[PDB]
Structure 1
Amino acid sequence: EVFQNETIKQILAKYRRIWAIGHAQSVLGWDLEVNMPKEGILERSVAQGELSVLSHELLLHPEFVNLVEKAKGLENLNEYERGIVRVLDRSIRIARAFPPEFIREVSETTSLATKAWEEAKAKDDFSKFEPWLDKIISLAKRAAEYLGYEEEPYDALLDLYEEGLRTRDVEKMFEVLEKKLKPLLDKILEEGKVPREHPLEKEKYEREWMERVNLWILQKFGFPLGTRARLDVSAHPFTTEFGIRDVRITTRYEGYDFRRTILSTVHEFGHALYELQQDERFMFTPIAGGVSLGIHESQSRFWENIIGRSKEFVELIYPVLKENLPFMSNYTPEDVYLYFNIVRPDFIRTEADVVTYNFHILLRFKLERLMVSEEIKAKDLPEMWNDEMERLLGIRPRKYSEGILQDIHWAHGSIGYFPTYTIGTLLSAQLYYHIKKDIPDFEEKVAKAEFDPIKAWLREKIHRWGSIYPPKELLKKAIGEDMDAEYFVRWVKEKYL
């Protein structure tokens, strides 16, 4: 049926091994964050490394590569079998772009740069990370040359994190935002409409109270606990796919500002539902699973912002908040709504509201493009970051930790990564209007906890496709168009004005 071709089948058979190591890498990663006794890190780390080299070795074995090439030279194949080849070709390609010596240099520099960044952020000192940032800039440019690119070198890094993404693509969405979203922010901020803060931010809670609420919400979403999924706690919330029938998410309980743990769980649910609603005929193959960071964040932001911060979701969860939270006997459902939608330009990207969030990514996009294109100097980055933070949000970091040092990404060498976050927020708005068309009683269904039709919509339009088509081709096919920042602007306009 789905996989008929003989060459395709020999590929998939070998792929199972590669798939198996990945299954193990997932469990290892998850357990490291969730259960592993502190001192087990050294042995966990070596195990993780030996497998990564093994995995890489298997993917590039002459036999495997020969089969892929061969199959790529076949015209008989259906879309599914073709997907296998597109996906695996991109993998083999990216994998052999880096000379083993370079992969080594990066691992080394990265490891040491993260450690140097980690203390530099805590002690507010950019000098302890500066040199490392210059080394990371050089590697990025080299990487761009190893990968190859048509227009700009930055296209190569961007394409690394989002298949088919180009600098011109990123350049465009941010233009639409700077001219149409920026003013909307100013207007919102000056009318005193929504508040910049809320007293519920200070309300303290005991872990068990909120885990009762989160649990309740996940059950309302139909999250298959104990059967195909799990919810646990970790330093930072994340989602993992051990398989189509085993997807797990985590969250954290800060102990205060309950909005955090709630929306964070919903955000991850969004990533999980996607993996959960994959097509089981693709099990053990490279076509199963989300196609990219961008499409993936479209799913997490859909559930978090489109639904989680909507008034209906607030009414739905309101009674549950009252039952488990004592301090809730002093607030009304509107109080919770205003709380869930506060808008306030601030220093930290991870804390930014939905309106100010994308500007944090835009500035990171500008510094990144310059870093890899012109001859930028690390020692000069802090000021460019600060001037940008000031030009977009009116505020200026007073210490490195509130500015250029807040995120780990650059120290890990993740250059060209940041823009996929904006893509998700944008796509989450676009998707909303398209579903708002086939399900006009969207809001009513949310208020009543009838999410099956919405889950089913997402499945048919995005999820079931897995990695069959590249990100862009996937959108056209399912939404009849490409990404368009415009929707995000309307969504915001229609929500705050």
Structure 2
Amino acid sequence: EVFQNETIKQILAKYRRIWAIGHAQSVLGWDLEVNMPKEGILERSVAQGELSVLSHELLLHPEFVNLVEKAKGLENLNEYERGIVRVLDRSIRIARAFPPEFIREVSETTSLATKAWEEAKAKDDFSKFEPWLDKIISLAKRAAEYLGYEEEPYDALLDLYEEGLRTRDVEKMFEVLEKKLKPLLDKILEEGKVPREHPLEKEKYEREWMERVNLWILQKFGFPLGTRARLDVSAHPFTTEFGIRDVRITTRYEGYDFRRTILSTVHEFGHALYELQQDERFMFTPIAGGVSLGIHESQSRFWENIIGRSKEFVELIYPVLKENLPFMSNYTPEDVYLYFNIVRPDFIRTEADVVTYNFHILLRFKLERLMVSEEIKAKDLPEMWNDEMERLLGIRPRKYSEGILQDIHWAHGSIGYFPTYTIGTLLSAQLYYHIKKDIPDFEEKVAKAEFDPIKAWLREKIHRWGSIYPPKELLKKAIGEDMDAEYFVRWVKEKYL
């Protein structure tokens, strides 16, 4: 029916083995974080390693690659079948762009590099990690050559984490944020409307109190708990898809600052819904699943910030908070909303509010570009970081852990990854104004917990296409236009001005 070409079918049967191995990995990883007694790590680690090598092997097997090149040349394929070919053609090209010994080198350098990152952080001493960063930079440039770019070295790595993304796209979006968000940010600070801190940040809670709250929210979102999804606790919130009918999320309960576990939970719901709403006809195939990190982030941010931080959502949840949190007797829905919408320039990215958040990513983009496209030395980075930080947020890191040693990303050799976060942020606001024209009383829906029509809109515009189309093609198909940072600027204004 959907897949009827004889070659496409042969490709799909061979792919089921690859898919299967992926299902095992997802469970292995999920379990690692959620149930695995600590000493099970070693054996768990070797099993994952072995599986990773196996799947790569299968992906590059001459029979599988050849079948794909053959289908690539067929003229009678339907759009779904063409999706399969497109997706695999790209995975195969990336999977074989790096030589086997280069992959070996990157694996070895990064492992030591991260061990050195942890050392440098524990000693608030950058010199420990410095020499290893220079070796990562060098590898990042070799990597760019391997994938090959066609404009600028940094394009190759940007494309690696967000298919089709070019340095121009990122440059332009941030160019817009510097001319409009920045002054917008400075006015909100002096303005006053929203605070830089809130006492609710300090209120304590017992685990049980907040998990009831989280469970309440998910139920109202219509999360298929026990049926097609689960909620668990782990060290770091994430989402994992075992299948279209088995998507799991996790959150953590710090024991204070309850906004954290909520928005974190809603954030993951955003990702999970994308996977839950995949076209079941695509089950077991390469076109089922979110297309990119950028698009996935647009979904998590849509739910977390476009909805999770709105007054209607706050109003919708308020009675539940009051019902489970004793200290809530002293706070009104206005308190909570202000608490949910704190704007405050600070050092830690993961701590950043939605208005200052992107500038953190903007700084990483700037440095990363210079590192891969130019010839900078690791020793000069920490100071560049602090200058950009002061220039954008008006604060200068006083400790390495407050600046360049925040994230391990560069230590994992993950260069060109960061801008995907801003992509999610901007796209969230952009989708906001688009769903708004099909659902003008969007806010009323949130207040009344009538999320079905919102979820089905996301489903028909984004989720259902899985990976049939690359990110840019997918976005134009959903809203008829390219990504544009202007929408985010409007959202912040409308939000705080």
Q: How far apart are residue 91 of structure 1 and its match?
A: 0.5
Is 1:239–1:250's contact at 8 Å kept on the other side of the alignment? yes
Name the CA distance, whole Å, in 2 between partners of 1:370 and 1:250: 36
State the 1:114 CA deviation. Answer: 1.5
Shift of 1:118: 1.8
Paired with 1:329 and 1:121, the residues of 2 have a C-alpha distance of 41
Aligned to 2:40: 40
> Which digits, 9 at most, give the CA deviation of each residue in 1:336-394, with x for residues without a partner?
00000000000000000000000000000000000001111001000000000000000
Specify the SS of the correspondent of 1:97: coil
Q: Distance in 1 between matches of 2:155 and 2:398?
A: 33
Q: Is residue 410 of structure 2 the alignment partner of residue 410 of structure 1?
A: yes
**Whole-Å Cα distance in 2 between the matches of residues 311 and 100 of structure 1?**
53
Alignment of 1:309-328 (within 5 A): 309-328=309-328
Alignment deviations for residues 395-453 of structure 1 (CA, whole Å, 9 cap, x no partner) = 00000000000001101111000000000000000000000100011100100111000
CA distance in 1 between partners of 2:371 and 2:96 (Å): 25
- Using the alignment, how far apart are the partners of 1:388 and 1:64 within structure 2? 48
Deviates more, 1:119-128 or 1:185-194: 119-128
Q: Give the gaps of 5 or more residues in structure 1.
A: none
Q: How far apart are the structure 1 equivalents of 2:15 and 2:39?
A: 34
**Counterpart Cα distance in 2 of 1:309 and 1:118:** 34
**CA–CA separation in structure 1 for the residues paired with 2:325 and 2:127:** 45
Q: Give how far 1:2 is off.
A: 1.0
Secondary structure at the aligned position of 2:203 is classed as: coil
2-structure distance, mates of 1:197, 1:256: 14
Partner of 2:189: helix, strand, or coil? helix
Q: Quote the offset at 1:219 in angstroms.
A: 0.3
1:99 maps to 99
String of CA shifts for 1:188-237, please: whole Å, max 9, x gaps: 01112210000000001110000000000000000000000000001100
For the aligned residues, what is the CA RMSD? 0.6
> In the aligned structure 2, how far is the partner of 1:329 from the partner of 1:4?
62
| The 10-residue stretch of structure 1 (189-198 or 378-387) with the greater mean CA deviation from structure 2 | 189-198
Deviation digits for residues 472-491 of structure 1, max 9, x if unmatched?
00011110101000000000
Quote the Cα distance in structure 1 between the aligned partners of 2:465 and 2:193: 41
Query: How far does residue 49 in structure 1 lie from its aligned partner after superposition?
Result: 0.5
The equivalent of 2:198 in structure 1 is: 198
Q: Mark the runs of 5 or more structure 2 residues left unpaired by the alignment.
A: none
User: In 1, distance between residues paired with 2:306 and 2:122?
Assistant: 35
Matched residue SS, 2:96: helix
**Aligned equivalents of 1:209, 1:116: Cα separation in 2:** 40
Q: Could you tell me whether the CA contact under 8 Å between 1:269 and 1:300 is conserved in 2?
A: yes
Residue correspondences, number: 497
Report what 1:56 is aligned to. 56
- Offset of residue 93 of structure 1: 0.3
Q: Does the residue aligned with 1:315 lie in a helix, a strand or coil? A: helix
- CA distance in 1 between counterparts of 2:372 and 2:350 reads 24
Partners of 1:232 and 1:129 lie apart in 2 by 35
CA distance in 1, matches of 2:45, 2:131: 26
On the 8 A contact 1:207/1:253 being kept in 2, the answer is yes
Question: Shift in Å at residue 122 of structure 1?
Answer: 2.7
How far the C-alpha of 1:184 sits from its partner, in A, is 0.2
Give the deviation of 1:248 after TM superposition. Answer: 0.2
Alignment map for 1:471-490 (pairs within 5 Å): 471-490=471-490
The answer to whether the Cα contact below 8 Å between 1:233 and 1:250 also exists between their aligned partners in 2 is yes
What are the superposed Cα offsets for residues 273-300 of structure 1, whole Å, 9 maximum, x if unpaired?
A: 0000000000010000000000000000
TM-score (norm 2): 1.00
Is the partner of 1:388 in helix, strand or coil? helix
How many Å apart are 1:127 and its aligned residue? 1.2
- Under a length normalisation based on structure 1, what TM-score does the superposition of the two structures give? 1.00
1:40-91: CA deviation from partner (whole Å, max 9, x where unpaired):
1111111111111100000000000000000001111011111111110101
In structure 2, how many angstroms separate the alpha carbons of the residues matched to 1:132 and 1:313? 46
Partners of 1:275 and 1:426 in 2: CA distance: 21
More moved, 90-99 vs 124-133: 124-133
What's the offset of the Cα at 1:178?
0.4
Report the Cα offset of residue 123 of structure 1.
2.3
- Per the TM alignment, residue 119 of structure 1 is displaced from its structure 2 partner at its CA by 2.6
Residue 4 of structure 1: CA displacement? 0.9
Instruction: Indicate conservation of the 8 Å contact 1:97/1:147, yes or no.
Output: yes
Aligned partners of 1:116, 1:30: CA distance in 2, in Å?
A: 27
Distance 1:312 1:404 in 2: 38
For 1:417, what is the secondary structure of its paired residue? Answer: coil
Residue aligning to 1:332? 332
Give the CA deviation at 1:153.
0.6
1:244 touches 1:278 (CA, 8 Å); kept in 2?
yes
Q: Deviations over 1:98-147 (max 9, x none)?
A: 00001111111111111221232232111111111111111100000000
| CA distance in structure 1 between the partners assigned to 2:493 and 2:273 by the alignment | 28
Query: Cα deviations across residues 155-198 of structure 1 (Å, max 9, x unaligned)?
Result: 00000000000000101100111001111001101112210000
Distance 2:408 2:272 in 1: 24
1:251 is displaced (CA, Å) by 0.3
Moved more, 188-197 or 289-298: 188-197
Contact 1:122 1:401 in 2 (8 A): no
Aligned partners of 1:209, 1:111: CA distance in 2, in Å? 40
Decide which moves more: 185-194 or 480-489. Answer: 185-194
Partners of 2:159 and 2:378 in 1: how far apart? 24
**SS of residue matched to 1:397:** coil
Query: How many percent of aligned residue pairs carry the same amino acid?
Result: 100
Runs ≥4 residues deviating over 3 A: none
CA distance, structure 2, for counterparts of residue 140 and residue 409 of structure 1: 13
Q: Is the 8 A contact 1:270 1:299 kept in 2?
A: yes
The corresponding residue for 2:307 is 307
